[PDB]
Amino acid sequence: GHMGQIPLKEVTFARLNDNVRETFLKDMCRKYGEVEEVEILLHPRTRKHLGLARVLFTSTRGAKETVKNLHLTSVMGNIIHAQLDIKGQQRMKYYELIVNGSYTPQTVPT
């Protein structure tokens, strides 16, 4: 890939339906790229799904294609947000807004 200052291989998801956990994310992302790692973010005290996830791909092409196919796509009844993210910078902003701010998993501003 040529667009980033570093390779763009990691996707941040937000507003995931709380049934979309590690196995689902792997099952659905592997249709769009080679998946290396999946992580869902949980509330620090309740351990509940924040609707946030990280998916790391083998190539930048897999990450771009996942974003193209899944951004603004409805998956078990919720519209997903999916974008390339460097070092979880946007992911951790969403984490703070839900966990320590007034927002919820389905209302976090992206």
What does this structure look like?
This protein has one domain (about 1-110). It is about 25% helix and about 25% strand. The protein is built from 3 helices and 6 strands, in the order βαββαβββα. Strand 2 (about 35-40) and strand 3 (about 50-55) form a beta hairpin.
Quick structural gist:
This is Histone-lysine N-methyltransferase SETD1A. Belongs to the class V-like SAM-binding methyltransferase superfamily. This protein is 27% helix and 27% strand.
Write the layout of secondary structure elements.
Layout (H helix, E strand, L loop, with lengths): L9 E5 L7 H8 L5 E8 L6 E9 L2 H11 L3 E2 L2 E2 L1 E4 L4 H11 L11
Antiparallel strand pairs: 1-3, 1-6, 2-3, 4-5
Subcellular location: Nucleus speckle; Chromosome; Cytoplasm
Family: Belongs to the class V-like SAM-binding methyltransferase superfamily.
Protein name: Histone-lysine N-methyltransferase SETD1A
- Strand content bin: 25-35%
Order of helices and strands: EHEEHEEEH
| Strands in their spatial order, largest beta sheet | 2-3-1-6
**Rg, nearest Å:** 13 Å
**Fraction of residues in helices?**
25-40%
Record field, number of beta strands: 6
Helical stretch count? 3
Largest sheet: 4 strands, antiparallel
Structural shape = globular
Return the structural class. Answer: alpha+beta
Number of domains: 1
PDB class: structural protein
Keywords: setd1A, RRM, structural protein
Assembly: monomeric
Entry title: Crystal structure of the RRM domain of human SETD1A
